[PDB]
Structure 1
Amino acid sequence: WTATSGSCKGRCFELQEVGPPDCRCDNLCKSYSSCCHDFDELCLKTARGWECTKDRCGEVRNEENACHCSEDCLSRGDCCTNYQVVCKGESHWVDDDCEEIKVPECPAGFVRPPLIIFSVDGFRASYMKKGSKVMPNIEKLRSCGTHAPYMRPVYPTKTFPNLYTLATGLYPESHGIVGNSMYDPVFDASFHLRGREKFNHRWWGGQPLWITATKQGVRAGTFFWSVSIPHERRILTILQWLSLPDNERPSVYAFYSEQPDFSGHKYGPFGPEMTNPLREIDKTVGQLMDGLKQLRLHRCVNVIFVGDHGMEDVTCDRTEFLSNYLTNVDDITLVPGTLGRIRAKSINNSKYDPKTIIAALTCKKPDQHFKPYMKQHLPKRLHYANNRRIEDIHLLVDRRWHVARKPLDVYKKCFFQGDHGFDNKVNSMQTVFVGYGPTFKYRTKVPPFENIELYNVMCDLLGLKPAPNNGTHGSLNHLLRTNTFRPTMPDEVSRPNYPGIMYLQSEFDLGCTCDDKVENKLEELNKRLHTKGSTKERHLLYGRPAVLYRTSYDILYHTDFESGYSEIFLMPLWTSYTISKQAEVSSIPEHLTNCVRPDVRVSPGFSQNCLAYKNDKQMSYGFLFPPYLSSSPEAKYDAFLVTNMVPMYPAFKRVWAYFQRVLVKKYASERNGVNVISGPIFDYNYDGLRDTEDEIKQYVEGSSIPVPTHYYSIITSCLDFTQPADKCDGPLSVSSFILPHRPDNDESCNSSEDESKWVEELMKMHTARVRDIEHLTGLDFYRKTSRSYSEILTLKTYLHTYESEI
């Protein structure tokens, strides 16, 4: 119940919201059907429109008008935004030349530059170039401020998950808004775009920017606008708040627009109907900037122009139907569209089996336009599994397609030409970032980055301590003139042991054999030098990785590679080696096919054994430093050490061997040498974080050798590829991957073909940031370089996406 008999007089767009049954007058009262009876009359005036005209100038104030052109309007804070232009001979902001804003120029009373967020729904990154002719205000923000060519949204590339990620710095799996539609099985409740359940705070986790501000004494304008409030009224409300007394005035504001998304769904991302929506959003930016100029705030405020996701061409005819795959289609509930999520229709169904559902959806039709995954097997870069609202079965839908349960859902539930939600590396899903103001840089282009990073910077802009989030604070310091955040490197928690030769060969009873007794004062000294770290500069180019948790491990040096060997997990945490452009690939010699050799520096009790692999009929082994890239026949023996061995399913060994035998040399050739760090990852609870020993669900049969869920590589070279990776004077270049360690290649529909036709495609899908590997391993990379720490943080957030140019 709401007592709508109360009044909005002197309360229009009040900041503090009131509780039922008292009627409301805030930004969202319409969405709750709770506005006071006179809210439209008092708060939503429209008389005479939104613009001053020459005949209105100096008018007698009429309080009924939407905005004012009377001599008193500036002191009242409610002039039409073009008042000074029409009535006082001023220029529109867009018409003024860009001039660098070196320092804030703020009116007295202003404690800090205000932050104004201008959020646009469905604004695809390429509109900034493709639409620049019809968007002169936006184009001036972009050219004169700081801009990226695009900003990467989060998956799924839907509205509510991305806007809330913008606000919180969190992945959707952490903030809880994991789709526009959700079912939470603990609450037994459903969240939908339409309706009241979505207002319950239990759905909205983390801590959004307006709550971080308010908790630390910084006042915030409300970030939400009921859809029926015209954009012109939203802008005038923001400008009116900006004229409040100092102690009442907010420091952070947001505007939101439903466009260009609304028209993009109807017309497709580049439909001829799309120009007018772009012109109108531009005109709204111009209102804001003219209004700021009137308030003398246009060289004081920092403005962020930002979108949630882009827009792809999608039509009703490009829909896959699960009814063409499943015998049992009425036993499942599908959350449909540009992603699919599947759960049982009834929890009382003992006939429900996700294994038979996955198999019936796997590579069944030659041009099949979606791929099924158990969520834990989705690319780790998506960070889309650790939430009970995310269904176990996931369908990743190809760009331009939909998935639906049955045909009748598509005509009884073509209209639309555009949609979004696909994989967040897809070019059409990328969106926009421009920052303009005293705290941003002048005429500066910055490389693409992730929307999770902005919360830290907005906190930086407002003098706030950010709540814990998934940004890497400092990785965006190059966007900023001042207010940078100067992080320190984390301290190493575990120091390594450096074992020498401590065991005789006969102390080992591992069931391994090697034809190595085929093997000199000159050159024995040399091998001793290698085992003590004499080639280590060549192979560990950025320092040893620091271990940020408590564990027991050894540094092991070799001619061709260096590793940190865990005595707890019985295998390396990391293995680091450099391959020059001139490096030669060799074979594994016939007499060494089955060679595994005890490592006389590491106890038998802290070693793997061969008999366990013999006995486990599902599990084989591979090597982290590849025997194919040995520098000499004699150095090659090192590659067969029991301390370089890792458990690998035979199907996975097809992938790994092609990566090691073929692709590393190809990258060294292309990049002018590469430094590679490889290793295992254990993430059995799919939380994106390193597992402890007691979270491991699978071991090589009969042993304490834990089985990795994934294997990573970080591949680093010189950004200036005229310099070799090992003699690089300036910035670095990196690509990395986190490959799922699976017992089949069901993910790759073409895997019966030669590895050259499918492996690199798999690896591309599983591309990763170095930061993703850090979370999954508890290791900190790039500890000793010539580079600034913020530059290294940017490097660690880089994702190599393999898309063509935006």
Structure 2
Amino acid sequence: WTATSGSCKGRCFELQEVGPPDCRCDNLCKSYSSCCHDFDELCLKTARGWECTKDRCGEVRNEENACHCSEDCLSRGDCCTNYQVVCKGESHWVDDDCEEIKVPECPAGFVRPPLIIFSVDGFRASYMKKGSKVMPNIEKLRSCGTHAPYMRPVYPTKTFPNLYTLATGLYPESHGIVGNSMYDPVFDASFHLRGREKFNHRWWGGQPLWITATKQGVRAGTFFWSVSIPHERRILTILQWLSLPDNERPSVYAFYSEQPDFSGHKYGPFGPEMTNPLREIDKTVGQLMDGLKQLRLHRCVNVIFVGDHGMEDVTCDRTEFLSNYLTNVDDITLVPGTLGRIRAKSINNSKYDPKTIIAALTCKKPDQHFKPYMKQHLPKRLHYANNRRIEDIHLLVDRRWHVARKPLDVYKKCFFQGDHGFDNKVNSMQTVFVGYGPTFKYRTKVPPFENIELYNVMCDLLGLKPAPNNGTHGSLNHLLRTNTFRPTMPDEVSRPNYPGIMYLQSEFDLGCTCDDKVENKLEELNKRLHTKGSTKERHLLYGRPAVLYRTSYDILYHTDFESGYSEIFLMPLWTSYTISKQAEVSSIPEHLTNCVRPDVRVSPGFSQNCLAYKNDKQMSYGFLFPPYLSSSPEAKYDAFLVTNMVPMYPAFKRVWAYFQRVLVKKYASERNGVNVISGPIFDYNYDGLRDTEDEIKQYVEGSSIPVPTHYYSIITSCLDFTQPADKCDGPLSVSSFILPHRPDNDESCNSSEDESKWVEELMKMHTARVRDIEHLTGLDFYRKTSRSYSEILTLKTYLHTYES
């Protein structure tokens, strides 16, 4: 109930929320059906429009006007945004040359530059260049301030997940808004755009910027705007809030525009009808900046121009129907469109089986435009699994397509030429970032980055301590003139052991064999030096990774590679080796095909054994340092140590071997050497975080050898590729992957063909950030370079996306 008999007199867009049943006057009151009787009359005036003209200059103040051109309007804070231009001979902000803001220039009483976030729905990155001729104000922000060529949204590339990610710094799986539509089985409740459930606070996890500010005593404007409130009125309300007295005035503000998303769904991303919405946005920016000039705040406020996602070409005719694949289409519930989520229609049908649904959906049609996954097998870069609201079965839809249950769902619910939601590495889904103000750099371009990183910077711009989030604090310091946050490396938790030769061969009983009884201080003091780490500076280029948890591990040195060998998981956590541009690929000699050799530095009881792989008919083994890249016949024997061995499914060995025999050499040729770090990952509970020993769900049969869920590699070289990887004086370049360790290649529909046609395509789909690997392993990389730590953090967040 709302007794809406109170009055908004003197309260229009008040900042406190008055509780039920007393009526409200805040910018959300419509959406809650709770406004006071006179809200429209007093708070949403429209008389005479939004601009001053010549003949209003110095008028008599009349309070019914939407905005004023009277002499007292600056005092009152309520002039039309163009008042000084028309009535006092001033220029529009956009017509002024830009001049560096080297220091804030704020009026008396401003404790800190305010932040204004100007958010635009569906603003595709390529609009900044392709629309620049009709967007002069936005183009001046971009060229004068700090801009990226694009910003990467989160998955799914929908509005609510992305706007709440911007506000919290968290992945959707962590903040809880995993879609525009959701079912929560614990609550037994549904979230939708139409209805009242989406208001309940229980959907909304984490801590958004406006709460963070409030708890730390920085005042915030209200971020949400009811769709009927026109843009011009949104802008004037922000400016009115900016003339409030010092003790009452917010320091952070948001504007939001439904455009150009709205028009983009109807007309497609580059439909001729899209020029007009882009003009309109620019005009709105122009009003804000002119309004800031009038208040003397245009060299004081930091402004962020930011989008939630892009837009792609999508039509009704490009729909796949689950009814053309499944027999029992009526026993499922599908969340449809640019992504697919499937669960059982009824909780009381135990003739529901995901395995059979998946299999009926896997590589069934030659051109099939979606690919089914169990959520834990989705590429780890999407971070889209660890929430009860994400259904176990997921369909990743190709760009330009939709998935639906049956054809009647499409025509009886074409009407649209654009949509969004696809994989967040797709170029059409990329969106924008520009920062302009005293705290941002002047005429600076920065590389593309992820929207999960912005919360930290918005906290820095306001002097706030960010709540715990998924950004890497410091990774965006190169956007800022000052207010940098100066991070320190985490402390290493476990120190390694450095074992020497401690065991005789006969103490081992591993069931392994090797034809190595083939037999001098010349070549012998020399191989001893190799076991104490004489070549370690060639192979470990950025220092040893640090172990950030408690555990027991050994550093092992070899001529061609170095490892950190876990006595608990019985395999390396990491294996590091450098492959120069001149290196040669060899084969495994015929006598050495099944060679595995005990390591006399490591005890029997902390070693794998070959009997277990013999008895496990499902499981085979591979090596982390590849024998194919040994520097000499004699060095090759090191590559067959039991301490370099890791469990691999025969199907995964096809992928692994091709990566080791062909691609590493190819990368070395192309990048002028590469340093490689490889190893395993255990993430059985799909939370993106390393599993502890007591959480392992699968072992090589009859043994304590744990089976990895994934295998990673980090591949590093010199950004200036005229220098070799191992003698690089400047910035680095990296790419990485986290491959799923799976017993089949069902993910790859061409996998019966030669590896040269499908392996690299799988690896690109499972591209990753070094940071992603950090979370999954509890390791910390690049500890000893000559680069600044901020730069290294930027490198660790880089994602190689293989879009052109």
TM-score range, shorter chain: over 0.9
Deviations 1:659-679 (A, max 9, x none): 000000000000000000000
CA distance in 1, matches of 2:650, 2:10: 73
CA distance in 1, matches of 2:734, 2:519: 39
CA distance in 2, matches of 1:751, 1:16: 60
CA distance in 2, matches of 1:32, 1:766: 44
Deviation, structure 1 residue 68: 0.3
Per the alignment, in what secondary structure is the counterpart of residue 291 of structure 1?
Answer: helix
CA distance in 2, matches of 1:400, 1:501: 60
Deviation, structure 1 residue 199: 0.5
Deviation, structure 1 residue 518: 1.1
Over the aligned positions, Cα root-mean-square deviation in angstroms equals 0.4
Deviation, structure 1 residue 193: 1.0
Please show how residues 453-468 of structure 1 align to structure 2 within 5 Å: 453-468=453-468
Deviations 1:78-112 (A, max 9, x none): 00000000000000000000000000000000000
Deviation, structure 1 residue 750: 0.3
Deviations 1:613-665 (A, max 9, x none): 00000000000000000000000000000000000000000000000000000
Deviations 1:551-606 (A, max 9, x none): 00000000000000000000000000000000000001100000000000000000
Deviations 1:358-413 (A, max 9, x none): 00000000000000000000000000000000000000000000000000000011
Deviation, structure 1 residue 214: 0.1
Deviation, structure 1 residue 20: 1.6
Deviation, structure 1 residue 33: 1.0
Please show how residues 590-629 of structure 1 align to structure 2 within 5 Å: 590-629=590-629
CA distance in 2, matches of 1:705, 1:607: 9
Deviations 1:235-254 (A, max 9, x none): 00000000000000000000
Per the alignment, in what secondary structure is the counterpart of residue 163 of structure 2?
Answer: helix
Q: Choose 205-214 or 26-35, whichever is displaced more.
A: 26-35
Per the alignment, in what secondary structure is the counterpart of residue 86 of structure 1?
Answer: helix
Per the alignment, in what secondary structure is the counterpart of residue 31 of structure 1?
Answer: coil
CA distance in 1, matches of 2:387, 2:135: 40
Deviation, structure 1 residue 781: 0.1
CA distance in 2, matches of 1:758, 1:34: 58
Deviations 1:769-790 (A, max 9, x none): 0000000000000000000000
Deviations 1:98-145 (A, max 9, x none): 000000000000000000000000000000000000000000000000
CA distance in 2, matches of 1:646, 1:728: 32
2:181 equivalent in structure 1 = 181
Deviations 1:441-463 (A, max 9, x none): 00000000000000000000000
CA distance in 2, matches of 1:328, 1:619: 35
CA distance in 2, matches of 1:54, 1:207: 48
CA distance in 2, matches of 1:765, 1:248: 50
Deviations 1:4-56 (A, max 9, x none): 11111111001111222111111111111111110000000000000000000
Per the alignment, in what secondary structure is the counterpart of residue 522 of structure 2?
Answer: helix
Deviation, structure 1 residue 278: 0.2
Please show how residues 120-135 of structure 1 align to structure 2 within 5 Å: 120-135=120-135
Deviations 1:515-560 (A, max 9, x none): 0111321111010000000000000000000000000000000000
Deviation, structure 1 residue 159: 0.1
CA distance in 1, matches of 2:251, 2:757: 55
CA distance in 1, matches of 2:656, 2:560: 19
CA distance in 1, matches of 2:463, 2:110: 14
Deviations 1:61-80 (A, max 9, x none): 01000000000000000000
CA distance in 1, matches of 2:468, 2:6: 41
Per the alignment, in what secondary structure is the counterpart of residue 636 of structure 2?
Answer: helix
CA distance in 2, matches of 1:130, 1:420: 19
2:108 equivalent in structure 1 = 108
CA distance in 2, matches of 1:21, 1:604: 74
2:168 equivalent in structure 1 = 168
CA distance in 2, matches of 1:345, 1:669: 53
CA distance in 1, matches of 2:18, 2:351: 50
2:415 equivalent in structure 1 = 415
Per the alignment, in what secondary structure is the counterpart of residue 565 of structure 2?
Answer: strand
CA distance in 2, matches of 1:568, 1:227: 58
CA distance in 2, matches of 1:396, 1:696: 28
Deviations 1:420-477 (A, max 9, x none): 0000000000000000000000000000000000000000000000000000000000
Q: Which ranges of structure 2 fall in alignment gaps of 5 or more residues?
A: none
Per the alignment, in what secondary structure is the counterpart of residue 20 of structure 2?
Answer: coil
Deviation, structure 1 residue 194: 1.4
CA distance in 2, matches of 1:319, 1:502: 65
CA distance in 2, matches of 1:24, 1:630: 74
Per the alignment, in what secondary structure is the counterpart of residue 37 of structure 1?
Answer: coil
**Which runs of 4 or more aligned residues in structure 1 lie more than 2 Å from their structure 2 counterparts after TM superposition?**
none
Per the alignment, in what secondary structure is the counterpart of residue 522 of structure 1?
Answer: coil
Per the alignment, in what secondary structure is the counterpart of residue 524 of structure 2?
Answer: helix
Per the alignment, in what secondary structure is the counterpart of residue 739 of structure 1?
Answer: strand
Per the alignment, in what secondary structure is the counterpart of residue 596 of structure 1?
Answer: coil
Q: Choose 364-373 or 3-12, whichever is displaced more.
A: 3-12
Deviation, structure 1 residue 504: 0.3
Verify: 1:568 aligned to 2:568, yes or no.
Answer: yes
CA distance in 2, matches of 1:86, 1:739: 62
2:706 equivalent in structure 1 = 706
2:759 equivalent in structure 1 = 759
CA distance in 2, matches of 1:520, 1:342: 68
Per the alignment, in what secondary structure is the counterpart of residue 183 of structure 1?
Answer: strand
CA distance in 2, matches of 1:661, 1:373: 29
Q: Choose 22-31 or 235-244, whichever is displaced more.
A: 22-31
Q: Choose 257-266 or 19-28, whichever is displaced more.
A: 19-28
CA distance in 1, matches of 2:529, 2:430: 51
CA distance in 2, matches of 1:17, 1:750: 59
CA distance in 2, matches of 1:20, 1:558: 73
CA distance in 2, matches of 1:738, 1:797: 14
1:262 equivalent in structure 2 = 262
Per the alignment, in what secondary structure is the counterpart of residue 749 of structure 2?
Answer: coil
CA distance in 2, matches of 1:268, 1:793: 37
Per the alignment, in what secondary structure is the counterpart of residue 20 of structure 1?
Answer: coil
Figure out how many residues of one structure are paired with residues of the other and give that number: 804
1:138 equivalent in structure 2 = 138
Per the alignment, in what secondary structure is the counterpart of residue 521 of structure 1?
Answer: coil
Verify: 1:551 aligned to 2:551, yes or no.
Answer: yes
Deviations 1:260-285 (A, max 9, x none): 00000000000000000000000000
CA distance in 2, matches of 1:157, 1:389: 17
Deviations 1:319-355 (A, max 9, x none): 0000000011000000000000000000001000000
CA distance in 1, matches of 2:801, 2:23: 50
CA distance in 1, matches of 2:24, 2:675: 62
Q: Choose 639-648 or 1-10, whichever is displaced more.
A: 1-10
1:669 equivalent in structure 2 = 669
Please show how residues 300-449 of structure 1 align to structure 2 within 5 Å: 300-449=300-449
Deviations 1:694-729 (A, max 9, x none): 111000000000000000000000000000000000
CA distance in 2, matches of 1:9, 1:386: 48
CA distance in 2, matches of 1:58, 1:120: 35
Per the alignment, in what secondary structure is the counterpart of residue 273 of structure 1?
Answer: helix
